[PDB]
Amino acid sequence: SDPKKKMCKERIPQPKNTVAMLNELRHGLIYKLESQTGPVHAPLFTISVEVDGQKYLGQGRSKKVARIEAAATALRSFIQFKDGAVLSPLKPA
């Protein structure tokens, strides 16, 4: 099927997003949709952000979500507090 979200003029105003955090940390970050799949009720978007040579992957139900997910991984790669969270999807098919 492939539900191709063509509308990118819709903002879905949700600041405090990790992608903004990444822009405060390191430049050269490219958020690119490497793969798009999933159902129509909740498709799976796979955004890859390449930062400092490390490609961080984020998989969400929209480009926006996936972009956030990608940046989240990147953030903890730079600064890492006493999080110790095992919340990290390792290739979830």
Side-chain angles (χ1 to χ4, degrees):
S1 313
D2 303 310
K4 296 308 181 184
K5 184 185 184 62
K6 295 167 293 298
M7 173 55 63
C8 50
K9 284 65 173 179
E10 47 178 85
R11 320 297 166 158
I12 307 298
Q14 299 187 271
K16 304 171 178 299
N17 51 332
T18 50
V19 320
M21 297 282 297
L22 237 182
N23 275 273
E24 305 285 71
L25 300 180
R26 300 290 287 167
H27 64 243
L29 65 171
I30 309 98
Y31 297 94
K32 46 192 164 178
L33 185 65
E34 56 165 66
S35 301
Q36 193 281 326
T37 44
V40 65
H41 69 270
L44 195 286
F45 291 70
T46 306
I47 292 278
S48 37
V49 62
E50 204 173 310
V51 189
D52 274 88
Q54 275 299 268
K55 196 284 290 290
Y56 307 93
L57 203 63
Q59 305 197 270
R61 305 301 152 166
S62 299
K63 288 181 171 181
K64 178 193 172 79
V65 188
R67 189 181 289 173
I68 291 174
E69 299 279 90
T73 309
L75 298 185
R76 85 192 308 213
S77 186
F78 298 116
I79 67 283
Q80 182 56 88
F81 304 73
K82 187 54 59 183
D83 162 78
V86 295
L87 202 168
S88 304
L90 300 178
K91 303 181 300 180

